[PDB]
Amino acid sequence: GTGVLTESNKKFLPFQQFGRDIADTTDAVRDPQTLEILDITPCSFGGVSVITPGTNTSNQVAVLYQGVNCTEVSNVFQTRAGCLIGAEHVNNSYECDIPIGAGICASYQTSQSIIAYTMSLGVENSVAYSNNSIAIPTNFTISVTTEILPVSMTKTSVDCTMYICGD
Amino acid sequence: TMSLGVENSVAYSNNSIAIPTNFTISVTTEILPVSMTKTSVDCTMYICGDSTECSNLLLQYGSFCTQLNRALTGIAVEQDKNTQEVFAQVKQIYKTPPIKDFGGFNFSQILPDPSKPSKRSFIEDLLFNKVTFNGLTVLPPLLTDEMIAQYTSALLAGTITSGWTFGAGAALQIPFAMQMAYRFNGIGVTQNVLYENQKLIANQFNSAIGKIQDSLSSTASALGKLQDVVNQNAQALNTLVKQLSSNFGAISSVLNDILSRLDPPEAEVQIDRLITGRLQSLQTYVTQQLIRAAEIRASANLAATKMSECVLGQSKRVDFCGKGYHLMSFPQSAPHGVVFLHVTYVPAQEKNFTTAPAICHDGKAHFPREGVFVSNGTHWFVTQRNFYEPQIITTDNTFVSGNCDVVIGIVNNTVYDP
Amino acid sequence: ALGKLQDVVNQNAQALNTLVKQLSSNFGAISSVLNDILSRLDPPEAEVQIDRLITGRLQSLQTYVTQQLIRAAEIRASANLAATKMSECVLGQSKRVDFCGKGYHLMSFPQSAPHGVVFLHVTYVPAQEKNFTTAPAICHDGKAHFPREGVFVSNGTHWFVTQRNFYEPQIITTDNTFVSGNCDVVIGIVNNTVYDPLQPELDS
Amino acid sequence: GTGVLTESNKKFLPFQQFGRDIADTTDAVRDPQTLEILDITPCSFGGVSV
Ligand SMILES: *[C@@H]1O[C@H](CO)[C@@H](O[C@@H]2O[C@H](CO)[C@@H](O)[C@H](O)[C@H]2NC(C)=O)[C@H](O)[C@H]1NC(C)=O
Ligand SMILES: *[C@@H]1O[C@H](CO)[C@@H](O[C@@H]2O[C@H](CO)[C@@H](O)[C@H](O)[C@H]2NC(C)=O)[C@H](O)[C@H]1NC(C)=O
Ligand SMILES: *[C@@H]1O[C@H](CO)[C@@H](O[C@@H]2O[C@H](CO)[C@@H](O)[C@H](O)[C@H]2NC(C)=O)[C@H](O)[C@H]1NC(C)=O
Ligand SMILES: *[C@@H]1O[C@H](CO)[C@@H](O[C@@H]2O[C@H](CO)[C@@H](O)[C@H](O)[C@H]2NC(C)=O)[C@H](O)[C@H]1NC(C)=O
Ligand SMILES: *[C@@H]1O[C@H](CO)[C@@H](O[C@@H]2O[C@H](CO)[C@@H](O)[C@H](O)[C@H]2NC(C)=O)[C@H](O)[C@H]1NC(C)=O
Ligand SMILES: *[C@@H]1O[C@H](CO)[C@@H](O[C@@H]2O[C@H](CO)[C@@H](O)[C@H](O)[C@H]2NC(C)=O)[C@H](O)[C@H]1NC(C)=O
Ligand SMILES: *[C@@H]1O[C@H](CO)[C@@H](O[C@@H]2O[C@H](CO)[C@@H](O)[C@H](O)[C@H]2NC(C)=O)[C@H](O)[C@H]1NC(C)=O
Ligand SMILES: *[C@@H]1O[C@H](CO)[C@@H](O)[C@H](O)[C@H]1NC(C)=O
Ligand SMILES: *[C@@H]1O[C@H](CO)[C@@H](O)[C@H](O)[C@H]1NC(C)=O
Ligand SMILES: *[C@@H]1O[C@H](CO)[C@@H](O)[C@H](O)[C@H]1NC(C)=O
Ligand SMILES: *[C@@H]1O[C@H](CO)[C@@H](O)[C@H](O)[C@H]1NC(C)=O
Ligand SMILES: *[C@@H]1O[C@H](CO)[C@@H](O)[C@H](O)[C@H]1NC(C)=O
Numbered sequence: 001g002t003g004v005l006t007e008s009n010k011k012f013l014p015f016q017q018f019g020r021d022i023a024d025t026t027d028a029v030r031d032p033q034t035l036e037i038l039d040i041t042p043c044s045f046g047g048v049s050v051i052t053p054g055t056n057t058s059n060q061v062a063v064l065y066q067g068v069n070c071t072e073v074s075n076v077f078q079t080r081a082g083c084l085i086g087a088e089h090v091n092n093s094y095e096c097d098i099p100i101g102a103g104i105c106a107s108y109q110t111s112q113s114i115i116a117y118t119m120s121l122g123v124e125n126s127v128a129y130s131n132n133s134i135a136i137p138t139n140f141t142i143s144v145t146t147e148i149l150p151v152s153m154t155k156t157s158v159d160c161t162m163y164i165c166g167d
Numbered sequence: 168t169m170s171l172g173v174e175n176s177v178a179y180s181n182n183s184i185a186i187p188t189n190f191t192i193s194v195t196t197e198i199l200p201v202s203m204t205k206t207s208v209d210c211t212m213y214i215c216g217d218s219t220e221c222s223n224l225l226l227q228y229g230s231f232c233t234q235l236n237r238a239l240t241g242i243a244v245e246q247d248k249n250t251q252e253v254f255a256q257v258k259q260i261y262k263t264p265p266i267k268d269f270g271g272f273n274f275s276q277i278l279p280d281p282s283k284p285s286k287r288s289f290i291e292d293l294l295f296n297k298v299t300f301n302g303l304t305v306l307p308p309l310l311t312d313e314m315i316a317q318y319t320s321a322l323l324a325g326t327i328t329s330g331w332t333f334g335a336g337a338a339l340q341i342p343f344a345m346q347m348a349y350r351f352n353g354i355g356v357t358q359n360v361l362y363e364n365q366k367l368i369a370n371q372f373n374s375a376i377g378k379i380q381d382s383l384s385s386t387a388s389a390l391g392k393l394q395d396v397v398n399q400n401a402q403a404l405n406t407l408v409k410q411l412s413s414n415f416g417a418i419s420s421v422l423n424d425i426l427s428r429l430d431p432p433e434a435e436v437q438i439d440r441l442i443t444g445r446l447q448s449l450q451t452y453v454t455q456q457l458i459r460a461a462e463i464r465a466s467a468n469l470a471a472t473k474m475s476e477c478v479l480g481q482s483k484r485v486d487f488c489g490k491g492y493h494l495m496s497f498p499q500s501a502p503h504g505v506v507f508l509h510v511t512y513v514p515a516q517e518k519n520f521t522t523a524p525a526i527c528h529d530g531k532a533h534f535p536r537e538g539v540f541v542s543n544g545t546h547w548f549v550t551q552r553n554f555y556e557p558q559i560i561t562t563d564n565t566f567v568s569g570n571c572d573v574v575i576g577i578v579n580n581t582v583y584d585p
Numbered sequence: 586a587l588g589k590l591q592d593v594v595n596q597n598a599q600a601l602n603t604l605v606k607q608l609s610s611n612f613g614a615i616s617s618v619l620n621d622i623l624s625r626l627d628p629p630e631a632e633v634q635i636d637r638l639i640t641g642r643l644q645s646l647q648t649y650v651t652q653q654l655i656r657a658a659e660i661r662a663s664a665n666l667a668a669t670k671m672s673e674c675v676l677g678q679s680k681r682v683d684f685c686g687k688g689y690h691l692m693s694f695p696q697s698a699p700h701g702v703v704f705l706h707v708t709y710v711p712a713q714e715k716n717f718t719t720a721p722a723i724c725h726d727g728k729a730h731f732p733r734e735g736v737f738v739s740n741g742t743h744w745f746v747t748q749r750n751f752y753e754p755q756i757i758t759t760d761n762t763f764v765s766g767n768c769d770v771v772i773g774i775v776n777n778t779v780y781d782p783l784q785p786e787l788d789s
Numbered sequence: 790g791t792g793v794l795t796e797s798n799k800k801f802l803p804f805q806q807f808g809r810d811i812a813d814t815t816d817a818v819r820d821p822q823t824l825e826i827l828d829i830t831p832c833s834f835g836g837v838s839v
């Protein structure tokens with residue numbers, strides 16, 4: 001197999017050789033020579049996303065390793081969703097452009113490099129509320145909003161015999 | 168044999184009407200699942216975890232691994248979209264003023280508590296405390312619980328300080344004792360009822376909020392839907408993992424054992440059997456997840472509609488925003504879901520009265536404008552339909568129509584002239 | 586903006602493409618081309634190869650059919666939603682907030698689009714708001730006065746009654762207001778003179 | 790295979806013999822005796838509704 005052998009505190013009984021888990025794959029073993037306990041864990045595995053603005057704009061990308069510490073892999077960031085490499089970190093907060101996760105979103109801005117930042121929900125607005133104050137509009141705007149809804153998909157069909165066993 | 172309820176005949180008759188004389192400001196908890204766990208399964212790592220021969224054999228199946236990941240990523244994007252639609256209904260993050268002089272009501276049990284690290288209100292905290300590596304990775308949601316709590320706080324502040332206008336355009340402050348008067352006038356009860364009973368209504372609302380808090384804190388069998396969603400997802404993942412231990416006809420379910428005990432020309436048959444079995448299992452899991460995600464998407468669209476039509480504004484849709492007449496709603500976050508507290512106005516104490524469709528004064532039938540004619544036996548009054556507030560019959564509250572020869576059931580009386 | 590429709594078309598295309606590409610899979614046979622196997626092996630030996638290909642292609646077809654069923658369920662949900670919006674927003678005027686466009690709804694104008702429908706929700710939206718000092722009621726002669734339809738406001742000196750959604754101040758007469766009870770129960774009440782048009786005419 | 794051999798306007802290279810398709814079905818071929826490129830379109834098919 002393959003894994004990261006570590007010292008473990010599992011209390012093996014003298015007769016017991018190796019442990020298992022739900023998937024029945026060996027998880028902990030006993031070294032044949034020195035009768036100690038070795039926990040076996042998968043080395044490391046994670047998706048690799050390529051946060052990129054439109055190539056029509058720029059050819060610079062920032063790579064997100066999902067759910068891996070920034071030790072097992074310029075600019076490095078440790079988001080709760082993984083290690084983001086190649087994206088600058090900006091204390092400012094803007095609207096989400098390229099979602100990453102855990103409130104972190106990236107974008108392409110200003111001499112322009114991919115920035116990563118904790119997104120902002122909106123602009124603070126403290127309503128001047130009081131028990132004897134009412135705000136009444138004196139003017140109105142009529143607007144037209146477009147709302148697009150699918151209705152029907154493509155009416156398709158497949159000849160089972162001619163597809164599987166064409167002629 | 169199951170019983171459908173208490174038999175209850177109604178004393179109906181052509182000249183009898185029952186009019187309430189009081190009310191109850193109930194608060195109903197409604198729980199909806201908005202999103203589920205965003206998971207992604209690495210097809211090759213799952214079926215053929217670290218085995219060049221197994222990976223090569225799997226490759227012969229074309230794109231039976233690059234399409235499942237597409238579906239799961241689509242599900243994850245759909246989950247984020249569901250949460251965004253349900254909660255991100257408000258353009259600007261409002262916040263309540265430092266004072267809490269809301270005409271007598273008390274929202275301390277639903278507004279955020281700054282003391283706790285995450286600014287989640289008390290009921291949100293109760294809700295959170297009431298709900299509890301083989302190629303299957305669990306991605307984190309785009310919106311953290313803190314951000315969802317901020318969105319619910321923004322909606323609460325908007326509802327409290329501005330009623331429904333904050334969802335229609337620029338938010339407009341209005342005293343809460345007058346916002347509730349607007350709500351009451353909406354459900355037909357004239358606003359002179361709200362103001363005169365303001366203290367009683369405030370006490371009823373506070374007691375209802377306290378009862379909701381106690382019910383959530385005591386009855387562990389309340390957040391059934393969210394807990395069921397979480398349990399179903401975890402159970403599906405556990406079943407998918409346990410499927411790895413089945414031989415499917417192969418000599419052993421451990422890939423390394425087969426690789427280390429046979430030559431490739433012989434081990435290929437066993438590895439193909441295992442690959443087919445595990446691929447079938449993974450496809451079944453993906454189909455189950457697609458259907459369950461469709462169910463959750465329907466629930467999330469319903470929750471977004473409830474948020475838009477109850478919280479951002481009063482709704483007259485019957486039983487849509489809680490049993491009874493609807494005044495307002497207060498949203499709350501919850502683990503993988505939302506929880507509305509629907510405030511509802513339920514008439515409680517009714518009295519019988521002898522009614523009449525119209526009243527003849529001088530050969531002209533009179534009909535009420537907004538109300539109904541009722542009499543305590545000898546004297547007739549016109550009162551609003553949802554609260555016994557009798558008034559002398561004048562020419563204002565009543566309008567005339569023709570003579571008194573056609574209106575069935577008409578009765579005689581003297582119509583006062585101010 | 587048309588993404589919601591574009592995706593639909595795109596999705597369908599992808600499926601068909603994937604389905605067609607499934608014909609380029611050996612599925613454990615010797616060649617993805619059926620005619621090569623037919624012309625290169627005797628039936629007793631070609632049976633296994635053709636069975637492998639048939640199993641693979643049939644499984645792919647079942648997967649495609651299931652994906653189509655689910656996606657058509659999604660599209661049917663969207664079509665029911667669009668039918669509801671057409672029946673309510675267009676053929677009438679809905680009170681459902683944000684259902685027929687943000688703001689107050691006035692009317693809608695349906696428009697076709699490839700495999701979809703586009704509504705142009707017309708919405709009235711309040712624009713420029715002004716502060717005012719309000720009061721839930723007003724006492725005239727010991728009797729509280731509440732507005733029939735509107736709200737009491739005041740620019741600081743004089744009191745008016747104006748409709749909620751548009752500042753059109755009017756004098757506080759006994760026609761805008763209805764009386765109820767004495768001048769003690771209401772909280773936040775204020776004093777003012779409720780003018781009565783009947784009196785000057787009576788004097789005349 | 791079965792198809793309707795039609796004269797094609799494809800531009801085969803001197804070293805090319807088969808013109809494959811997205812589905813790995815030989816769509817264009819080079820006639821060995823006369824070096825011209827011919828397409829291969831399936832004859833015809835469809836549903837028969839009643
Ligand atoms: C209400 O707002 C509208 C804007 O939507 C105002 O219309 C503008 O009036 C000014 C006059 O000073 C013109 O120069 C603008 O061209 C008008 N706008 C448009 C879009 O035509 C209107 O005057 C406002 N009403 C009040 C009473 O303030
Ligand atoms: C409507 O119901 C409320 C209670 O829901 C009544 O208020 C109660 O009145 C009694 C007698 O005055 C008190 O002992 C209770 O403490 C009150 N309860 C509350 C919560 O305030 C009210 O009196 C009823 N309306 C009428 C007209 O009687
Ligand atoms: C709203 O209700 C809460 C109760 O949930 C009130 O908080 C209580 O306040 C009293 C007096 O200050 C304390 O003795 C209690 O210990 C508090 N309880 C809790 C749970 O905080 C709060 O004061 C009320 N707000 C208003 C404006 O009346
Ligand atoms: C029905 O209601 C009428 C009016 O509310 C009652 O008539 C009044 O009764 C009180 C009771 O003492 C008298 O002080 C008033 O002078 C009466 N006014 C008129 C105009 O009659 C009547 O008593 C009620 N009857 C019942 C059975 O409830
Ligand atoms: C209501 O009052 C009217 C008039 O006061 C009544 O009409 C009278 O009915 C009697 C019964 O035959 C006739 O003799 C009179 O000529 C009618 N007069 C008028 C002016 O119509 C009517 O009957 C009364 N109805 C009730 C239910 O009390
Ligand atoms: C508040 O509104 C009242 C209503 O018009 C204003 O009173 C009028 O003010 C104008 C402007 O000078 C005078 O020409 C009128 O004669 C006033 N009429 C009355 C009945 O007072 C008042 O000025 C407004 N207050 C402010 C601060 O603008
Ligand atoms: C509205 O006016 C009434 C009378 O015009 C005020 O009531 C008087 O208040 C003074 C001050 O306390 C008392 O000395 C009188 O005895 C009251 N008379 C009556 C008939 O109530 C009332 O205070 C005014 N409203 C406000 C908010 O000041
Ligand atoms: C194995 O042999 C080595 C050297 O002979 C010795 O150091 C070690 O303790 C032995 N261990 C066991 C379990 O016999
Ligand atoms: C790239 O974007 C610009 C503006 O954003 C547009 O004018 C141009 O047509 C785009 N080109 C391509 C190839 O998409
Ligand atoms: C990464 O490793 C460092 C070093 O031990 C540790 O401090 C940190 O908490 C780790 N972070 C994660 C996300 O594992
Ligand atoms: C953000 O601000 C903190 C404290 O103000 C600082 O320590 C940190 O370096 C800043 N981040 C960047 C990228 O400058
Ligand atoms: C009205 O009269 C009927 C007649 O029996 C009675 O059952 C009913 O309880 C009365 N109404 C109320 C509110 O009690």
Ligand SMILES: *[C@@H]1O[C@H](CO)[C@@H](O)[C@H](O)[C@H]1NC(C)=O
Nearest residue numbers: 180181182574575576577578
């Ligand atoms: C109402 O119903 C009773 C039932 O007996 C009948 O006697 C009476 O005439 C009816 N009156 C009207 C006005 O319908």
Ligand SMILES: *[C@@H]1O[C@H](CO)[C@@H](O)[C@H](O)[C@H]1NC(C)=O
Nearest residue numbers: 128133135713714715716717
């Ligand atoms: C009302 O007055 C407050 C006082 O500070 C002010 O902040 C607010 O902007 C005013 N209302 C409007 C609509 O500007």
Ligand SMILES: *[C@@H]1O[C@H](CO)[C@@H](O)[C@H](O)[C@H]1NC(C)=O
Nearest residue numbers: 130131132268270772773774
């Ligand atoms: C409104 O609040 C202020 C705050 O001090 C208070 O002085 C005033 O009496 C309150 N008015 C009403 C009607 O509650």
Ligand SMILES: *[C@@H]1O[C@H](CO)[C@@H](O)[C@H](O)[C@H]1NC(C)=O
Nearest residue numbers: 819820821822823824825826
């Ligand atoms: C093949 O032979 C025939 C007859 O001998 C001749 O007409 C034809 O041109 C030959 N093919 C080529 C490619 O020369």
